[PDB]
Design an enzyme around this catalytic site. Structure first.
Site, PDB file in Angstrom:
ATOM      1  N   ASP A 138       6.635   2.095 -10.779  1.00 34.98           N
ATOM      2  CA  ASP A 138       7.193   0.941 -10.345  1.00 34.98           C
ATOM      3  C   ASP A 138       7.012   0.080 -11.570  1.00 34.98           C
ATOM      4  O   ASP A 138       5.899  -0.711 -11.711  1.00 34.98           O
ATOM      5  CB  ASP A 138       6.591   0.416  -9.074  1.00 34.98           C
ATOM      6  CG  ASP A 138       6.515  -0.894  -8.638  1.00 34.98           C
ATOM      7  OD1 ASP A 138       7.645  -1.639  -9.080  1.00 34.98           O
ATOM      8  OD2 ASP A 138       6.058  -1.234  -7.746  1.00 34.98           O
ATOM      9  N   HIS A 181      -1.610  -2.090 -15.746  1.00 34.86           N
ATOM     10  CA  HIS A 181      -0.375  -1.738 -16.391  1.00 34.86           C
ATOM     11  C   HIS A 181      -0.407  -2.366 -18.147  1.00 34.86           C
ATOM     12  O   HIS A 181      -0.969  -3.373 -18.374  1.00 34.86           O
ATOM     13  CB  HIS A 181       0.962  -2.258 -15.922  1.00 34.86           C
ATOM     14  CG  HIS A 181       1.505  -1.367 -14.940  1.00 34.86           C
ATOM     15  ND1 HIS A 181       2.378  -0.202 -15.245  1.00 34.86           N
ATOM     16  CD2 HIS A 181       1.462  -1.361 -13.500  1.00 34.86           C
ATOM     17  CE1 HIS A 181       2.756   0.480 -14.049  1.00 34.86           C
ATOM     18  NE2 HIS A 181       1.975  -0.190 -12.977  1.00 34.86           N
ATOM     19  N   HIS A 207       0.382   4.142 -14.548  1.00 34.85           N
ATOM     20  CA  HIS A 207       0.124   5.304 -14.221  1.00 34.85           C
ATOM     21  C   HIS A 207       0.731   6.591 -15.277  1.00 34.85           C
ATOM     22  O   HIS A 207       1.619   7.158 -15.252  1.00 34.85           O
ATOM     23  CB  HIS A 207       0.858   5.910 -13.099  1.00 34.85           C
ATOM     24  CG  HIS A 207       0.796   5.043 -11.742  1.00 34.85           C
ATOM     25  ND1 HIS A 207      -0.393   4.816 -11.081  1.00 34.85           N
ATOM     26  CD2 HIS A 207       1.613   3.752 -11.278  1.00 34.85           C
ATOM     27  CE1 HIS A 207      -0.204   4.235 -10.135  1.00 34.85           C
ATOM     28  NE2 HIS A 207       1.115   3.304 -10.252  1.00 34.85           N
ATOM     29  N   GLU A 244       5.600  10.850 -12.278  1.00 33.92           N
ATOM     30  CA  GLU A 244       5.744  10.145 -10.951  1.00 33.92           C
ATOM     31  C   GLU A 244       7.135  10.495 -10.462  1.00 33.92           C
ATOM     32  O   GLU A 244       8.037  10.015 -11.186  1.00 33.92           O
ATOM     33  CB  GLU A 244       5.652   8.610 -10.860  1.00 33.92           C
ATOM     34  CG  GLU A 244       5.946   8.030  -9.657  1.00 33.92           C
ATOM     35  CD  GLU A 244       5.262   6.488  -9.384  1.00 33.92           C
ATOM     36  OE1 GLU A 244       4.116   5.870  -9.952  1.00 33.92           O
ATOM     37  OE2 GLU A 244       6.001   5.836  -8.290  1.00 33.92           O
ATOM     38  N   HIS A 296       8.745   9.270  -7.299  1.00 31.34           N
ATOM     39  CA  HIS A 296       8.623   8.498  -6.331  1.00 31.34           C
ATOM     40  C   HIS A 296       9.947   8.411  -5.544  1.00 31.34           C
ATOM     41  O   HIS A 296      10.219   8.627  -4.400  1.00 31.34           O
ATOM     42  CB  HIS A 296       8.188   7.176  -6.332  1.00 31.34           C
ATOM     43  CG  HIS A 296       7.912   6.387  -5.159  1.00 31.34           C
ATOM     44  ND1 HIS A 296       6.733   5.377  -5.136  1.00 31.34           N
ATOM     45  CD2 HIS A 296       7.964   6.777  -3.777  1.00 31.34           C
ATOM     46  CE1 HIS A 296       6.501   4.980  -3.879  1.00 31.34           C
ATOM     47  NE2 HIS A 296       7.032   5.958  -2.790  1.00 31.34           N
ATOM     48  N   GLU A 325       2.161   9.805  -6.693  1.00 31.24           N
ATOM     49  CA  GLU A 325       3.614   9.535  -6.154  1.00 31.24           C
ATOM     50  C   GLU A 325       4.269  10.472  -6.236  1.00 31.24           C
ATOM     51  O   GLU A 325       5.524  10.168  -6.318  1.00 31.24           O
ATOM     52  CB  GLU A 325       4.016   8.206  -5.963  1.00 31.24           C
ATOM     53  CG  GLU A 325       3.287   7.138  -5.050  1.00 31.24           C
ATOM     54  CD  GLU A 325       3.450   5.558  -5.319  1.00 31.24           C
ATOM     55  OE1 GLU A 325       3.874   4.972  -6.344  1.00 31.24           O
ATOM     56  OE2 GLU A 325       3.181   4.949  -4.404  1.00 31.24           O
ATOM     57  N   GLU A 359      -5.762   2.976  -4.728  1.00 33.29           N
ATOM     58  CA  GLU A 359      -5.221   1.500  -4.956  1.00 33.29           C
ATOM     59  C   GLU A 359      -5.689   0.966  -3.471  1.00 33.29           C
ATOM     60  O   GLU A 359      -5.545   1.329  -2.526  1.00 33.29           O
ATOM     61  CB  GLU A 359      -3.838   1.832  -4.885  1.00 33.29           C
ATOM     62  CG  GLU A 359      -2.974   2.036  -6.256  1.00 33.29           C
ATOM     63  CD  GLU A 359      -1.902   2.735  -6.306  1.00 33.29           C
ATOM     64  OE1 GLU A 359      -0.961   2.165  -5.935  1.00 33.29           O
ATOM     65  OE2 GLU A 359      -1.394   3.797  -7.004  1.00 33.29           O
ATOM     66  N   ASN A 395      18.027  -4.003  -7.895  1.00 33.42           N
ATOM     67  CA  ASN A 395      16.633  -4.371  -8.350  1.00 33.42           C
ATOM     68  C   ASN A 395      15.652  -4.641  -7.306  1.00 33.42           C
ATOM     69  O   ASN A 395      15.902  -4.548  -6.080  1.00 33.42           O
ATOM     70  CB  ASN A 395      16.780  -5.593  -9.349  1.00 33.42           C
ATOM     71  CG  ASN A 395      17.192  -6.717  -8.903  1.00 33.42           C
ATOM     72  OD1 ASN A 395      16.486  -7.625  -7.965  1.00 33.42           O
ATOM     73  ND2 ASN A 395      18.415  -6.995  -9.052  1.00 33.42           N
ATOM     74  N   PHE A 453       8.890  -7.892  -6.492  1.00 32.73           N
ATOM     75  CA  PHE A 453       7.643  -6.813  -6.264  1.00 32.73           C
ATOM     76  C   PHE A 453       7.068  -6.374  -7.338  1.00 32.73           C
ATOM     77  O   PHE A 453       6.237  -5.972  -7.262  1.00 32.73           O
ATOM     78  CB  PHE A 453       8.440  -5.959  -5.391  1.00 32.73           C
ATOM     79  CG  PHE A 453       7.227  -5.145  -4.391  1.00 32.73           C
ATOM     80  CD1 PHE A 453       6.841  -5.442  -3.436  1.00 32.73           C
ATOM     81  CD2 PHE A 453       7.251  -3.671  -5.154  1.00 32.73           C
ATOM     82  CE1 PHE A 453       5.675  -4.854  -3.028  1.00 32.73           C
ATOM     83  CE2 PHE A 453       6.164  -2.567  -4.333  1.00 32.73           C
ATOM     84  CZ  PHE A 453       5.380  -3.329  -3.504  1.00 32.73           C
ATOM     85  N   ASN A 507       2.317  -8.430  -9.004  1.00 34.05           N
ATOM     86  CA  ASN A 507       1.156  -8.038  -8.035  1.00 34.05           C
ATOM     87  C   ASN A 507      -0.504  -8.432  -8.715  1.00 34.05           C
ATOM     88  O   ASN A 507      -1.262  -8.020  -8.050  1.00 34.05           O
ATOM     89  CB  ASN A 507       1.076  -6.859  -7.587  1.00 34.05           C
ATOM     90  CG  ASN A 507       2.690  -6.115  -7.017  1.00 34.05           C
ATOM     91  OD1 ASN A 507       3.161  -7.075  -6.255  1.00 34.05           O
ATOM     92  ND2 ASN A 507       2.836  -5.163  -7.549  1.00 34.05           N
TER      93      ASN A 507
HETATM   94  O1  LIG Z   1       4.245   0.328  -6.860  1.00 37.45           O
HETATM   95  C1  LIG Z   1       2.815   0.008  -7.092  1.00 37.45           C
HETATM   96  C2  LIG Z   1       1.912   0.944  -7.089  1.00 37.45           C
HETATM   97  O2  LIG Z   1       2.489   1.818  -8.219  1.00 37.45           O
HETATM   98  C3  LIG Z   1       2.169   1.922  -5.663  1.00 37.45           C
HETATM   99  O3  LIG Z   1       1.488   2.909  -5.693  1.00 37.45           O
HETATM  100  O4  LIG Z   1       1.663   0.804  -4.685  1.00 37.45           O
HETATM  101  C4  LIG Z   1       2.512  -0.250  -4.571  1.00 37.45           C
HETATM  102  C5  LIG Z   1       2.478  -1.121  -5.904  1.00 37.45           C
HETATM  103  O5  LIG Z   1       3.136  -2.355  -5.770  1.00 37.45           O
HETATM  104 MG   LIG Z   2       5.784   4.236  -7.082  1.00 36.74          MG
END
Ligand SMILES: O[C@@H]1[C@H](O)[C@@H](O)OC[C@@H]1O
Ligand SMILES: [Mg+2]
Ligand SMILES: O[C@@H]1[C@H](O)[C@@H](O)OC[C@@H]1O
Ligand SMILES: [Mg+2]
Lengths: 1015, 599
Positions: free
Chosen positions: B193, B349, B383, B408, B410, B453, B529, B589, B593, B596
């Protein structure tokens, strides 16, 4: 572009454009055809005549060959190995790689086979659906073209490679072009001990599938605690456009009866946060009181998988045999269907003496029947996945299978150089994952193996854990790195001994009884290779079987191995002969080390096969007085095709017999009371013999097949009758050169300079061609030579110790030679010393007593120096002038037997033609011994005593100097070896001393006696 | 030949002609320079001005570009992301892949960056030895030419790629040509992400080694029960022609004092029936009362490895920082130096608002000081593997690090579609094995992670067991497939709550107090997390800290996350403003988000 990239020298490229691995498919378009296993119109064979050209390297192939056929190409049969047609030499090598070790490069001189085929494809195959080509096996690497366009690239010789041909075919004449290389980076992972050959050596096929198709399916079985209810669980994946009207049906059939059935649409249960597999479905079927699969009773069901529309229309059908069985390891034992297995196993290579490494159904079926007829229940695929038909036959006839990944790096230094390197993990993973994907539905496969002799590396741990996680229904084994690493569920040593430790640095071989009890150890032990059967071998086999039966966590092992890997060659006259390493001009090579089988390459048995049959029997017998106690070693079947023949005989002559039907539960006992036995007047030993006979034919045996036997001594009466006094006295004459004894027409002559019996006459007919002399040596066996690599010599080997000490060169010196007239006999007395360079090795003192009845009694006393290596034998030999047709003896037989391989032979009166008294081992050695003999008749001669003998047309000298059986020539007359004593033959392995101490001739003083007379 | 093969659309080809992975080397030719970490003349940077041209696809690159510079090329600074210079838009997306999901194919419209550099090589570099080029990171895949000849191909954006240049260089002017693709089959394993950007975004170097050279070395430490005696064990491998007069010396320094030393010839102990490694050696050094490394007191020693002849002449020297510390899991607790850790962690990051994904020392140092000033002791590399300097700074200042493989997936359906397929096991194994080979000597790295993920697949079990067997000195963690599978030593949930259960099908999130006590469960729990810090947030933070301190097997976690991923844009007057997803014309997009951060 193709010769620019050099994909065969890059361990990171193992394929290009190759389809995913899956179980065997036929793509039936009719559920009845699928159920009954009839041939599919959608599966077409391309086996037959192809065109072939050989080239010395891939840069010598002309560009035109992709377009059209070469003029200078031949027509050959596919499948084949090109070395079996004389295009280059096959290479026999054990450890050393047949190329320079420089991974990942191969030589620039890389022999290349160019194959091509022109074939017709029907119109209907191109309109819709998907057409693929399947290569069942190509050795070692290949590029594929179709109609001049490049399709793809493959490696790993022992598993199928599939390519999509849909966009390359056209209606009418098509042409394939396959370029095959002998060497590739894949060659570094295929260093098995075998002939190194190449070509398209397994079948080629076209398969037509619909665009919406079954792309994979697996079958799992789950049971309740007493195996009375089962759930069959089928997972099906589809490829193609997903639609709401698609359905899958799974039905299970036993013969013609449907037993269970399930239908569902696509879409699995939620797997994770993103959802489930939309293209997959899982059916659960219940089965009450299922018939269980085992090697004793191979009950199979048939599973049909149908992909159809909701309104009934069938798209495609697939099928497989299903056996219900559970394998697991529980509390340190390997269990099948809740009972502990005892593995009667053998290792088996895919080998044919004419066709090389090409298998057919007929040869496969012949091997399975012989295995089962000799009490084997299990087979190890040494050391690669077999032909796909092999598993189907093992499912149907009932053998347990160990399936093995095609990985062996024996010639690397150290052995784990590649298996511990992460750059090779991609190439190793393809070998293991594609094997599990192809074979996981076969019920006969019960254990996966990660390969052979590759040390221990992190890549092995990774792949061990991959298999446990995709297929938890079967244990994983791996022997490398000391046979008990973290990458094995079973301790699985190779050639560990029963009682003796072999304490090598880093990778010790404990004795199997000690290994079980090492601090921390809880796994079961199954030898992945034991009792190396090279030439005249399997001594000490009974000792393993005693230990397997006594210790619960010793669950058996796999003999090395099933069939001799010899090839056929022709001489000037066109007569065939058996050939081993070096016989093709191949160099360097490992000579006769490729012949280790229980059977000859044409599937005739060696004499060791009968020893394996007896030790592996399923009935065990005890005798207590008049009662025999029969114990069953079957786990699953009642004895319902068995009757017990008993016989009592007195020194060969029968006295009483009978048959009792066997009725014994699995693991049970039956007592059998024998009728009051007859008391004989005459002297001699009584023997009881029992045999279990199968009265009805089975799938694998004829009517009357003998499956088990045992023999015992009963009462003995010693002979107290003094011999009848004869009137005649033999007459002694004494010259300077000779003592001569006459009696009737008989004459004996002893040479006074040599001190040996030099001639006998009956009438005027001379009986000997060579004098009667002591013998202390044998023509060495393969276990005596003790070499596995032809470049490396062991000084501990028996033959090297005997040669250094001078046993083959020792010259007899006469000490004493005298003659006396007694009242009714003549007595001759001799002594001899055998010397080598001052050192006395043996002393022999003999008496010959010639009485009035004409019997010569010979008494021999031998001393052996304590510091010379123990001799191979203590006996006499001579060459008799006559050649008779039959040999008649009273003693152990009828097959060849040695002091440490005689448990299978029975005491009785045997009669064979002379040519059956010689065992034609491809590499000539001592052979043909019969032990425990009381009487031997040959022509007019009779010998009595308690001795061992062999009789033949070949001297020990001729057998020692000749390297191949086809070069032996019959000598004049017959060579007789009579032994008081004979050393064991060994065979725990063949590359170190392996004769146990109780079978060595270490007593220092020996005594024996014979009577020679004319019957 | 190159556009014919299409190596970027084939998950079975992840590299061509790329050298083996190893720890960072400088190839000093003087033991004093090695000990004191002075710059090496044998390690040359090529960072600076290169020439660059942008193309919409790899079939639009002209053939002439391999021979000579294009007229219509610009001068750009390397390292850089080309989207930070306005050649195309950066894309902010969370779960959904920024391309059509059709693995392993990518779109035919695949933006392509063509970089080139003209440089001079000294005469002495060609006479003897081996010259290699090292790309510290290129996103996503690239082909490399030198003087018009093709050298090699690489994938995985986050680890170095090295190529032998010896047979391609010439005295005087040389030219490199790098063609970089935005999308490749590697893109399917990199769905983190974050902003999706591309280019040569980490340093480029030439290294000169002798023909007989150190090719790898690892350092292990072993202690007695009360950490008063240690054995340091060093394994060194050489490449090149083996000779009887070659020796290896390992010496250990604390400041200016030598503390321990060992010399030996090549040839290890017997490994198996075929023998030992003739090209390897193992030194054991004893150290009495060693000073232990922790995040509270980061005591470091210096280890110098010398390859020399028996008569004293030095061939080559390498060095690394050594910290003495033992990490293990014992009776359900994570212990460091025999004491149970409490992790005050954050996810971080690699992000800069002007430079995009290009890091420098100054920004790295600023982040470490702020982290420590706010009572953090630990950082998770979310990651992917970081810049190699990051680990050196964490060793020196004292932070525990979780090092993470660049995997990853996801946006697949279901999440384990690729990680359960054996055809992807080759591509996943390169991401995990090359990370362990590069980073295993850093004392700050205390846990390996298998990525983020990606569901749970058989490929994860295989790679979990590969790491435990090559590196038993550190635990492995992995959160996918419900945070407690067989591929993890630590239960490591993401966003589980203190008191409340979240009972999702297949992959439930128990409350952290309930999870510890499920029938059978014995592992420690560390949240990979927690407490998502998006905007005005961290309500309920005290509730986690109350539970961490009360329950022994709750050993802390990593906050999500350190720094807002906003970028800078300019208005009409030239005033800067902070921009998030969608602000570059990127579509679809995920809007705001991407912000964070705690900062
Ligand atoms: O995407 C981010 C992270 O990589 C995920 O594991 O949890 C939510 C966060 O915003
Ligand atoms: Mg992700
Ligand atoms: O080479 C054969 C087998 O593969 C090995 O494991 O043991 C010896 C035998 O002859
Ligand atoms: Mg071998």
């Amino acid at each position: 572009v193709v010769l620019q990239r050099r994909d065969w020298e890059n361990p990171g490229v193992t394929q290009l454009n190759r389809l995913a691995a899956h179980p065997p498919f036929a793509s039936w378009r009719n559920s009845e055809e699928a159920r009954t296993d009839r041939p599919s119109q959608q599966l077409r064979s391309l086996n037959g005549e192809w065109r072939f050209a050989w080239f010395p390297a891939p840069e010598a192939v002309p560009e035109s060959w992709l377009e059209c056929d070469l003029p200078e190409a031949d027509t050959v049969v596919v499948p084949s190995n090109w070395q079996m047609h004389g295009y280059d030499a096959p290479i026999y090598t054990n450890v050393t790689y047949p190329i320079t070790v420089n991974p990942p490069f191969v030589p620039t001189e890389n022999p290349t086979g160019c194959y091509s085929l022109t074939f017709n494809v029907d119109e209907s195959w191109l309109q819709e659906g998907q057409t693929r080509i399947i290569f069942d096996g190509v050795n070692s690497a290949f590029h594929l073209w179709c109609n001049g366009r490049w399709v793809g690239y493959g490696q790993d010789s022992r598993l199928p490679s599939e390519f999509d041909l849909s966009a390359f075919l056209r209606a009418g004449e098509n042409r394939l072009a396959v370029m095959v290389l002998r060497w590739s980076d894949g060659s570094y992972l295929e260093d098995q001990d075998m002939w190194r050959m190449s070509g398209i050596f397994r079948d080629v096929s076209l398969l037509h599938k619909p665009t919406t198709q079954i792309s994979d399916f697996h079958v799992a079985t789950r049971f309740n605690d007493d195996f009375s209810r089962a759930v069959l669980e089928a997972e099906v994946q589809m490829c193609g456009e997903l639609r709401d009207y698609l359905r899958v049906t799974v039905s299970l059939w036993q013969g013609e009866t449907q037993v269970a059935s399930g239908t569902a649409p696509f879409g699995g249960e939620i797997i994770d946060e993103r959802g489930g597999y939309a293209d997959r479905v899982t059916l659960r079927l219940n089965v009450e009181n299922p018939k269980l699969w085992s090697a004793e009773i191979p009950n199979l069901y048939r599973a049909v998988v149908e992909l159809h529309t909701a309104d009934g229309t069938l798209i495609e059908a697939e099928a497989c045999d299903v056996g219900f069985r559970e394998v697991r390891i529980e509390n340190g034992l390997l269990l099948l269907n809740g009972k502990p297995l005892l593995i009667r196993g053998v290792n088996r290579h895919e080998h044919h003496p004419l066709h090389g490494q090409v298998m057919d159904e007929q040869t496969m079926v012949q091997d399975i029947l012989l295995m089962k007829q000799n009490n084997f229940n299990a087979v190890r695929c040494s050391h690669y996945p077999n032909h796909p038909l092999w598993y189907t036959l093992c499912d149907r006839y009932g053998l347990y299978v160990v399936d093995e990944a095609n990985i062996e790096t024996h010639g690397m230094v150290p052995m784990n150089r590649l298996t511990d390197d992460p750059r090779w993990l991609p190439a190793m993973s393809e070998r293991v994952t594609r094997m599990v994907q192809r074979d996981r539905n076969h019920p006969s496969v019960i254990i996966w193996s990660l390969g052979n002799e590759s040390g221990h590396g992190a890549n092995h741990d990774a792949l061990y854990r991959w298999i446990k996680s995709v297929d938890p229904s079967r244990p994983v084994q791996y022997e490398g790195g000391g046979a008990d690493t973290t990458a094995t569920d079973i301790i699985c040593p190779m050639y560990a001994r029963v009682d003796e430790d072999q304490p090598f640095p880093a990778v010790p071989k404990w004795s199997i009884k000690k290994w079980l009890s090492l601090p921390g150890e809880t796994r079961p032990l199954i030898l992945c290779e034991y009792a190396h059967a090279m030439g005249n071998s399997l001594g000490g086999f009974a000792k393993y079987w005693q230990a397997f039966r006594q210790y619960p966590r010793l669950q058996g092992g796999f003999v090395w191995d099933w069939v001799d890997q010899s090839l056929i060659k022709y001489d000037e006259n066109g007569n065939p002969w058996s050939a081993y390493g070096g016989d093709f001009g191949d160099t360097p090579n490992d000579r006769q080390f490729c012949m280790n089988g229980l059977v000859f390459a044409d599937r005739t048995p060696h004499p060791a096969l009968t020893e394996a049959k007896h030790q592996q029997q399923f009935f065990q017998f005890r005798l207590s007085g008049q009662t025999i106690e029969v114990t069953s070693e079957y786990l699953f079947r009642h004895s319902d095709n068995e009757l017990l023949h008993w016989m009592v005989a007195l020194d060969g002559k029968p006295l009483a017999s009978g048959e009792v039907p066997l009725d014994v539960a699995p693991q049970g006992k039956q007592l059998i009371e024998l009728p009051e036995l007859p008391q004989p007047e005459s002297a001699g030993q009584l023997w009881l013999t029992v045999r279990v006979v199968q009265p009805n034919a089975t799938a694998w045996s004829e009517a009357g097949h003998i499956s088990a036997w045992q023999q015992w001594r009963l009462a003995e009466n010693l002979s107290v009758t003094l011999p009848a006094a004869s009137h005649a006295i033999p007459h002694l004459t004494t010259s300077e050169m000779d003592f001569c004894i006459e009696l009737g027409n008989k004459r004996w002559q002893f040479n006074r300079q040599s001190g040996f019996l030099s001639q006998m006459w009956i009438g005027d007919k001379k009986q000997l061609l060579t004098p009667l002399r002591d013998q202390f040596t044998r023509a060495p066996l393969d276990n005596d030579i003790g070499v596995s690599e032809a470049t490396r010599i062991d000084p501990n080997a028996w033959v090297e110790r005997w040669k250094a000490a001078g046993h083959y060169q020792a010259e007899a010196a006469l000490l004493q030679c005298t003659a006396d007239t007694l009242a009714d006999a003549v007595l001759i007395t001799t002594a001899h010393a055998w010397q080598h360079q001052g050192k006395t090795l043996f002393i022999s003192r003999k008496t010959y007593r010639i009485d009035g009845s004409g019997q010569m009694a010979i008494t021999v006393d031998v001393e052996v120096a304590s510091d010379t290596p123990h001799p191979a034998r203590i006996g006499l030999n001579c060459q008799l002038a006559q050649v008779a047709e039959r040999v008649n003896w009273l003693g152990l037989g009828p097959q060849e037997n040695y002091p440490d391989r005689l448990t299978a032979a029975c005491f009785d009166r045997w009669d064979l033609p002379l040519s059956d008294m010689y065992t034609p081992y491809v590499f000539p050695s001592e052979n043909g011994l019969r032990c425990g003999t009381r009487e031997l008749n040959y022509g007019p001669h009779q010998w009595r005593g308690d001795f061992q003998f062999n009789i033949s047309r070949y001297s020990q000298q001729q057998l020692m100097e000749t390297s191949h059986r086809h070069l032996l020539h019959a000598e004049e007359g017959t060579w007789l070896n009579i032994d008081g004593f004979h050393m064991g033959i060994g065979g725990d392995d063949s590359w170190s001393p392996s004769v146990s101490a109780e079978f060595q001739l270490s007593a220092g003083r020996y005594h024996y006696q014979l009577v020679w007379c004319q019957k």
